[PDB]
Design brief:
part of a larger assembly, 5 chains, A mainly alpha, B mainly alpha, E alpha+beta, A: mainly alpha, 2 helices, about 0% strand, B: mainly alpha, DNA-binding, RNA-binding, transcription
Chain lengths: ~50, ~200, ~50, ~50, ~110
RNA sequence: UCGGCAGGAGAGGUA
DNA sequence: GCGCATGCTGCTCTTCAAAGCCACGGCGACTGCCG
DNA sequence: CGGCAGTCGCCGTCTACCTCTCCAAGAGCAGCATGCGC
């Protein structure tokens, strides 16, 4: 959803005929969310062995 | 710019509101730039300039009435003339009844415009006759008008500098003996408020 | 919270000593008041 | 319609004869000056809210 | 109906001006906004001849914008990637207060 | 004689 | 073979958006609100 | 004007000890470095 908001906001400030799917997509929010869940979270717990 | 300590205004109760005799909502509006307040009022010049200002106000009252009746007479002239010259020569007089209602709504258009103006003048005057210190006033429009026409004799602003001004012009003894007099001979809930 | 107060105070000083219209100065004064209020007690009024 | 459907019970009759808002546009305005305070109520915004 | 004010970030004035001028047409409201002016003043200064002209914005953080305002105008000039709000209000910002003729003229003339 | 360090948040446990 | 022009990744700097979110008991002021 | 009752916001909720992991991000802006053309 964050990436979708970014692409929607950036689709209206660029010039047409030079817009490609690779220039509209930002990966940083998704990897940030993934690495924040798998790290500092209350449900992904240190395993006891 | 001066600021206000949070401990002495956002408490239970509000000590600043108890000292200045102001509701906490009024204090919150004044401090955070959402309403005006009247710090001081020179009552001698609003005593000896009263009837003179009232006479100028009656001059504008009469001039607005004269304007209204002037263009109502000239609109009824145009009406009478055109209507009697073109009383549905070809078609049905329902069109001239539609423009009968439309001419009645033209008279009431200029009549409600003169009523609106009368109300503006009335409220301006009323506010300029009931202006005591520590009285909160909202609506930028009115304030600006009062400061344009009757600029002097009335002073006030918004922000913490106007509460510093209210605190500086404060008399502890008079309020203290007033509260003691109220508690001494009083009942109901005003005695509780004084306590 | 000190850095915020200093930044708002510096911007207010520079804007006051420039001849700015009243609306902008009032906005800056409100923002400085909020910053000081948050410095002394954070969360008492509004959101933290 | 309401009284025809919710007439087997009496609490709905009571509520019916004490709303004083008969009208979908004025009911839209009613909940508009409730969910969005301070804002000026326009039937179109209440319809969309 | 008159010149209003908008509040951008620190240093984000020319990007708000650019994004707004692009979204004037790209969006579709070409008859609402008219002129976008980022207040700026030529700071007289030289370093032994080499000039700099510091971009001393006469109002650091704000961008006056002449516009008509009804419904969609508030929306377009509030979601631009950079603007923070419509600085100017009577307590609840229900109808932003416009700049006063005089001050507006003496700002545009500087 | 140079030279030389110690804050917050979350989770799980024992009495 | 030399001169021009255009993009590497470290470093620096500055903070409103906006959805996301959903115990319990005691007390005291207070505030619209009905009457 | 005058009671008034609901409402909302602000206070308080046992002591000592052990082990582990994680801590702003994005965008602009350098001072060079490598390719292409005559």
């Amino acid at each position: 959803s964050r990436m979708e908001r970014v692409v929607r906001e950036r689709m209206t400030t660029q010039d047409v005929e030079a817009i490609t799917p690779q220039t509209l997509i930002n990966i940083r929010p998704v990897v940030a969310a993934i690495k924040e869940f798998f790290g500092t979270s209350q449900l992904s717990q240190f395993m006891d062995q | 710019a001066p600021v206000t300590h949070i401990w002495y205004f956002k408490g239970v109760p509000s000590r600043l509101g108890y000292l200045l005799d102001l509701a906490p909502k009024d204090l919150e509006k004044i401090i955070y730039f959402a309403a005006y307040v009247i710090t001081s009022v020179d009552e001698e010049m609003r005593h000896n300039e009263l009837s003179t200002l009232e006479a100028e106000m009656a001059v504008e009252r009469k001039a607005v009435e004269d304007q209204r009746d002037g263009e109502l007479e000239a609109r009824a002239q145009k009406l009478e003339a055109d209507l009697a010259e073109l009383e549905a020569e070809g078609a049905k007089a329902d069109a001239r009844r539609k423009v009968r209602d439309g001419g009645e709504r033209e008279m009431r258009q200029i009549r409600d415009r003169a009523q609106r103006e009368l109300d503006r003048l009335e409220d301006i005057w009323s506010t300029f006759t009931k202006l005591a210190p520590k009285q909160l006033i909202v609506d930028e429009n009115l304030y600006r008008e009062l400061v344009d026409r009757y600029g002097e004799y009335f002073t006030g602003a918004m922000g913490a500098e106007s509460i510093q001004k209210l605190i500086e012009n404060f008399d502890i003894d008079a309020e203290a003996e007033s509260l003691r007099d109220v508690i001494r001979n009083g009942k109901g809930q005003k005695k509780l408020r004084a306590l | 919270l000190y850095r915020r107060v200093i930044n708002r105070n510096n911007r207010l000083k520079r804007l006051i000593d420039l001849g700015a219209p009243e609306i902008i100065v009032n906005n800056e004064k409100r923002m400085l008041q909020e910053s000081v209020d948050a410095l002394f007690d954070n969360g008492r009024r509004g959101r933290p | 319609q309401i009284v025809e459907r919710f007439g087997f019970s009496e609490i709905m009759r009571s509520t019916l004869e004490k709303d004083n808002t008969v009208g979908t546009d004025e009911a839209l305005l009613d909940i508009y000056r409730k969910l969005r305070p301070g804002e000026p109520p326009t039937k179109e915004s209440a319809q969309t809210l | 109906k008159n010149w209003y004010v908008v509040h951008t970030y620190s240093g984000y004035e020319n990007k708000v001006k650019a994004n707004l001028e692009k979204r004037v047409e790209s969006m579709g409201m070409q008859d609402k906004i008219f002129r976008v002016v980022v207040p700026e003043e030529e700071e007289t200064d030289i370093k032994n001849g080499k000039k700099k002209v510091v971009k001393k914005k006469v109002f650091p953080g704000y961008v006056l914008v002449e516009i008509v305002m009804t419904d969609d105008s508030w929306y377009v000039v509030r979601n631009t990637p950079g603007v923070t709000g419509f600085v100017g209000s009577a307590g609840s910002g229900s109808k932003p207060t416009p700049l006063l003729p005089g001050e507006a003229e003496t700002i545009l003339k500087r």
